[PDB]
Amino acid sequence: RLFRKSNLKPFERDISTEIYQAGSTPCNGVEGFNCYFPLQSYGFQPTNG
Amino acid sequence: RLFRKSNLKPFERDISTLQSYGFQPTNG
Numbered sequence: 001r002l003f004r005k006s007n008l009k010p011f012e013r014d015i016s017t018e019i020y021q022a023g024s025t026p027c028n029g030v031e032g033f034n035c036y037f038p039l040q041s042y043g044f045q046p047t048n049g
Numbered sequence: 050r051l052f053r054k055s056n057l058k059p060f061e062r063d064i065s066t067l068q069s070y071g072f073q074p075t076n077g
Contacts, residue, residue, distance in 0.1 A: 034064075
C-alpha cells in the first residue's frame with residue numbers, strides 16, 4: 001500500500017483494495033488522474049543492490 | 050465534506066480528498 005485516507009493505528013491491518021481518492025473526481029473504480037490505486041507490486045531482480 | 054483541519058476562508062474551494070449523500074423521492 002502506498003496511499004491511504006489517513007494514518008493507521010498500531011496493530012491494525014486493512015484488506016480492502018479500492019482506488020485511493022486524493023484529488024476528487026472519482027475514477028469509477030479504475031486508475032485515475034487524481035485518484036490512484038494504493039495496491040501496487042514490487043520489482044525484484046537477482047542482480048540488484 | 051464533514052471534516053477539515055481548520056475553518057475555510059471566504060471564496061476558497063478545496064479539491065484535496067468526503068462522504069456520499071443519499072436522496073429519496075418520498076422524503077421530507
